[PDB]
Design a protein around this ligand. Structure first.
Ligand SMILES: [Zn+2]
Length: 173
């Protein structure tokens, strides 16, 4: 019952929140470890709760106030340009919803980044440099996809235009 009561609290907190809630925050609210929160959210996902784990924490998926434009963007940059590419997008008010790499073993690998702010980008680059961080490894030579979303198609156009200026787009060939 304690597990069921804890998971009931998680649902309530995720639905009330407008920002991602880290596993560490949820763990401290319920006096468990962050590994236990991983298991709780896994059980809730299997009961068809649209809960998403992002680089900044968990979100309960719900629809927005206004229709947000979306676009799939093919990108490619050097092994040390990732922070600059991500900062370029968030500075245009674009949500970096995910990244996808065409892996030769796993197939398409997609990570739900949900980067929105400069601090999101900085902390994500900080923690991934402090580990192996080879999702964008030597395998695809920098080639990767992004799902971007913004308030309008004109904002996406300008953000993508800024990527091309910096040479971060995959160019037709
Ligand atoms: Zn990228």
């Amino acid at each position: 019952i304690l597990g069921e009561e804890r998971r009931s609290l998680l649902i309530k907190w995720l639905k009330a929140s407008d920002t991602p809630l880290t596993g560490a925050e949820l763990a401290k609210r319920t006096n468990v470890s962050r590994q236990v929160i991983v298991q709780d959210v896994s059980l809730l996902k299997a009961k068809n709760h649209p809960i998403l784990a992002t680089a900044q924490g968990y979100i309960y998926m719900k629809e927005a106030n206004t229709v947000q434009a979306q676009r799939v963007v093919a990108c490619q940059h050097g092994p040390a340009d990732m922070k600059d590419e991500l900062l370029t997008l968030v500075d245009h008010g674009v949500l970096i919803k995910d990244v996808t790499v065409d892996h030769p073993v796993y197939g398409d690998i997609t990570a739900s980044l949900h980067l929105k702010s400069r601090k999101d980008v900085a902390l994500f680059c900080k923690r991934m440099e402090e580990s192996n961080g080879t999702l964008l490894s030597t395998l695809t030579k920098g080639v990767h996809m992004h799902t971007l979303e913004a308030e309008s198609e004109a904002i996406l156009d300008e953000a993508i235009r800024a990527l091309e200026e910096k040479g971060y787009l995959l160019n037709s060939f």
